[PDB]
Design a binder for this molecule. Structure first.
Ligand SMILES: *[C@@H]1O[C@H](CO)[C@@H](O[C@@H]2O[C@H](CO)[C@@H](O[C@@H]3O[C@H](CO)[C@@H](O)[C@H](O[C@H]4O[C@H](CO)[C@@H](O)[C@H](O)[C@@H]4O)[C@@H]3O)[C@H](O)[C@H]2NC(C)=O)[C@H](O[C@@H]2O[C@@H](C)[C@@H](O)[C@@H](O)[C@@H]2O)[C@H]1NC(C)=O
Ligand SMILES: *[C@@H]1O[C@H](CO)[C@@H](O[C@@H]2O[C@H](CO)[C@@H](O[C@@H]3O[C@H](CO)[C@@H](O)[C@H](O[C@H]4O[C@H](CO)[C@@H](O)[C@H](O)[C@@H]4O)[C@@H]3O)[C@H](O)[C@H]2NC(C)=O)[C@H](O)[C@H]1NC(C)=O
Ligand SMILES: *[C@@H]1O[C@H](CO)[C@@H](O[C@@H]2O[C@H](CO)[C@@H](O[C@@H]3O[C@H](CO)[C@@H](O)[C@H](O[C@H]4O[C@H](CO)[C@@H](O)[C@H](O)[C@@H]4O)[C@@H]3O)[C@H](O)[C@H]2NC(C)=O)[C@H](O)[C@H]1NC(C)=O
Ligand SMILES: *[C@@H]1O[C@H](CO)[C@@H](O[C@@H]2O[C@H](CO)[C@@H](O[C@@H]3O[C@H](CO)[C@@H](O)[C@H](O)[C@@H]3O)[C@H](O)[C@H]2NC(C)=O)[C@H](O)[C@H]1NC(C)=O
Ligand SMILES: CC(=O)N[C@@H]1[C@@H](O)[C@@H](O)[C@@H](CO)O[C@@H]1O
Ligand SMILES: CC(=O)N[C@@H]1[C@@H](O)[C@@H](O)[C@@H](CO)O[C@@H]1O
Ligand SMILES: *[C@@H]1O[C@H](CO)[C@@H](O)[C@H](O)[C@H]1NC(C)=O
Ligand SMILES: *[C@@H]1O[C@H](CO)[C@@H](O)[C@H](O)[C@H]1NC(C)=O
Lengths: 390, 391
């Protein structure tokens, strides 16, 4: 989408995976979906270095709305949970140097069953712009046909444009299409800054494997379409929650960098481990994700329960991820000829290799004919950066 | 098996899950299956408090053997990886106050393809006894029929008995019957100290869930036969490795205590986190597992992605485990009437409830009519010990 936004993948925080649709502020006031939750997250995004690392979008997912529209046909923030309204939340967020994201749905209801934007695209778009919203995640539930789905996504894109406000537009468009038809990513890119392709992530290694496997299986359809202003979205970072081993967390961070994915944390910034914080704020890995060239990486090869992925970077640099998918035993050795990397030009005539994950370490120079040996933990990943010597 | 052994579930270390069948001592001398690996683990079992916690059997799994039997028809330790032989290793382990376990197979080959014991049961039993072996894990691979399988397990039991040496006998018998024939656990218990029922564990939450779900699905068949000298084996503890989150590790430790499972660690004692070490050495949780009464726990209820398991303990006490199987969101509230716990007698007239996992904390007295409220992390478990107020 040619709105000057998302020239690198969008970085932020999104409540959904960790906090979901919790409406019970009686019993669980510190975890229910309320203005206080987002105000606290915004405070910690500044104070705990998240904004400095590059995470600038604080995003409300589903279950922020009142059950009904007001008498002027506008979406309302829940009166009990957002008593001061979204404008005041937006102003608070902007005062921290952050940006506010919000959620709506192309169909008649949100996926959680709250008011949809069908019949109200212009009104909702203007409401959001008038509130000071900076990002819109636009979901695809309760839409009665794929033609209405596509039309609505295009209408909302133009409606947001007409407001004149800079609003990052996130479309779940192709995710609801894939089961029935192959999406037209050329069309989707014209209207969207990024797009969810596949099923919702959850707090598990299984979920992460399915997203990677779906992405690598379908990489010829989706990789080349991605670029500055338009990204594939494999869903939220779930690092720092409950269901992932340390190695599986390193794997998600590494592969989301390789995939040029938007980096939307979904965790509790109030209660997050030092190690999870360090991984998510890793400047060298974020630098790969944020690389200005914006070429999405891909799976180079798979076999013997290993995978090798790579991503071309600006300045003739390459990022290389090697994943160990064998979930038994100990660290397993993997040897690759560097000549196989970067279409043969990464290390022609030579390259300097630095390991970034699981620990940062310089590995020295490598001639075009040389081989790289690494030991990779089960479900873990080794992430390398290659610098050409020319 | 009525041999005076395994009166509580056997506790120890078993190399298989973490080290497997690594024969490459050229490239990986510190992780290949060798006498050096086991000597290092035995040293650490003493020096890092494992033996004090109860872990006493240092067990060799598959891939210790040379490819051929000797001229007298005996199994041999691999000469390059165990150049000093099994006897000296057994002696070394015995000098630490530890016990040595070893692996063999009822069929023609071990699962990794090395010499099996079919046609050599007496010879192998005699060989192990002579070496000073204290435990035999006896596998069921490469057996042409279930009749031969059962006969071989019975023969080796009797062969071990005739040596006169006390040897804990671990039988994979029923795991190779399932789901083809219905195991008879009264028969199996007569010949074995414990028995693998289900597929090999690996370093994954999927595996742990698979083992728990299999067990709860089959609990009516297997729970009652368990007891002193005869245990169900749901396979190794894989805590301290690579594939489990903290909460999933807590879940394994809690449920293996509930299940009265043998506690065979498979990990690298040279490289294990203080957190993992503390969990595996948790005195209160080990005390539940090792309860003298030896009554295996069971799944009391499941619904809404929650599971409640309970185990009757000695001294009118009960262990209760609550698992959150929803793998999305945050800690989830769960409430249960304490009158539902321990078949209604645990908290009649009252009980004192102490949380043991994920952290230890006294919860206080609960009357028979009261309700217990807990918050449980995704893929995590809350483990409680109930103490009745009669004594
Ligand atoms: C799973 O395996 C176990 C152990 O083998 C079985 O339990 C055994 O069942 C047999 C019956 O087949 C019992 O034998 C009997 O023992 C009593 C002693 O109390 C004898 O009086 C009795 O003798 C009669 O029958 C014999 C037939 O050959 C003759 O020699 C005699 O002349 C006389 O007529 C017979 O020997 C075992 O005592 C019993 N062992 C144990 C440890 O309990 C399981 O059998 C089932 O469960 C048992 C508890 C019992 O209820 C059986 O009736 C059940 O069939 C077996 N389970 C299955 C599903 O087959
Ligand atoms: C609503 O939609 C319209 C129609 O697409 C959209 O107008 C477009 O805006 C973009 C971004 O501002 C314009 O592209 C720019 O063109 C100027 C002049 O040629 C260039 O200076 C810009 O290049 C710089 O910035 C780029 C990043 O955007 C960098 O890639 C580059 O290196 C430079 O630093 C940039 O190419 C585009 O010209 C118009 N298109 C049309 C048809 O007018 C408008 O922005 C949308 N409005 C809202 C509210 O979203
Ligand atoms: C080979 O097989 C034979 C036949 O099974 C086996 O003989 C059995 O050995 C066990 C264990 O030593 C004997 O069990 C003991 O029996 C006596 C009474 O006769 C009891 O005093 C013993 O009590 C101990 O264990 C109790 C557990 O309930 C404790 O409460 C108590 O504190 C004691 O520690 C114990 O029950 C059993 O009598 C014999 N059986 C027969 C028929 O002879 C032998 O051990 C096997 N040999 C090897 C080397 O495996
Ligand atoms: C949101 O819900 C509204 C209301 O139900 C949907 O509008 C309705 O859509 C149906 C079918 O999509 C329309 O039916 C059509 O009627 C014409 C005759 O006029 C007929 O030729 C067609 O074959 C079809 O049966 C219906 O007219 C329309 N009703 C209203 C009140 O507008 C809307 O499509 C839903 N939006 C999404 C995105 O799902
Ligand atoms: C693909 C997609 O957008 N999925 C979304 C998920 O991300 C979340 O927003 C949820 C809210 O109810 O609705 C969906 O299923
Ligand atoms: C059920 C059973 O005994 N499983 C065993 C496993 O625990 C290990 O010993 C392996 C060695 O090759 O062989 C088997 O599959
Ligand atoms: C995809 O969409 C673009 C823009 O609408 C169009 O030019 C192109 O033909 C479409 N591709 C196909 C084959 O559907
Ligand atoms: C082992 O092999 C022999 C010869 O092939 C066969 O007759 C015998 O039944 C086998 N034993 C088992 C336990 O499978």
């Amino acid at each position: 989408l040619d709105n000057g936004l998302a020239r690198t993948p969008t970085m932020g925080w999104l409540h959904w995976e960790r906090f979901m649709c919790n409406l019970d502020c009686q019993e669980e006031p510190d975890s229910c979906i309320s203005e206080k939750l987002f105000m606290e997250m915004a405070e910690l995004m500044v104070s705990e270095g998240w904004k400095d690392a590059g995470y600038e979008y604080l995003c409300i997912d589903d279950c922020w709305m009142a059950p009904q529209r007001d008498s002027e046909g506008r979406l309302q923030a829940d009166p009990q949970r957002f008593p001061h309204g979204i404008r005041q939340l937006a102003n608070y967020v902007h005062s921290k140097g952050l940006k506010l994201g919000i959620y709506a749905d192309v169909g008649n209801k949100t996926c959680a069953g709250f008011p949809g934007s069908f019949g109200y695209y212009d009104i909702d778009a203007q409401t959001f712009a008038d509130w000071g919203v900076d990002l819109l995640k636009f979901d695809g539930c309760y839409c009665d046909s794929l033609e209405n789905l596509a039309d609505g996504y295009k209408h909302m894109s133009l409606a947001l444009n007409r407001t004149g406000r800079s609003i990052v537009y996130s479309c779940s468009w192709p995710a609801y299409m894939w089961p029935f038809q192959k999406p037209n990513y050329t069309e989707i890119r014209q209207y969207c800054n990024h797009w969810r392709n596949f099923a919702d992530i959850d707090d598990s290694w299984k979920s992460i494997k399915s997203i990677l496997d779906w992405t690598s299986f379908n990489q010829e359809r989706i990789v080349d379409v991605a670029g500055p202003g338009g990204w594939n979205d494999p869903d939220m970072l779930v690092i720092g929650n409950f269901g992932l081993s340390w190695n599986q967390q390193v794997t998600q961070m590494a592969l989301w960098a390789i995939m040029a994915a938007p980096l939307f944390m979904s965790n509790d910034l109030r209660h997050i481990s030092p190690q999870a914080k360090a991984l998510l704020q890793d400047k060298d890995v974020i630098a790969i994700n944020q690389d200005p060239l914006g070429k999405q990486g891909y799976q180079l090869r798979q076999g013997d329960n290993f995978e090798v992925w790579e991503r071309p970077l600006s300045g003739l640099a390459w990022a290389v991820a090697m994943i160990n998918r064998q979930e038994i035993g100990g660290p397993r050795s993997y040897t690759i000829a560097v000549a196989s990397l970067g279409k043969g030009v990464a290390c022609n005539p030579a390259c300097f290799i630095t390991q970034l994950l699981p620990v940062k370490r310089k590995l020295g120079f490598y001639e075009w004919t040389s081989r790289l040996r690494s030991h990779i933990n089960p479900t873990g990943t080794v992430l390398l950066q290659l610098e050409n010597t020319m």
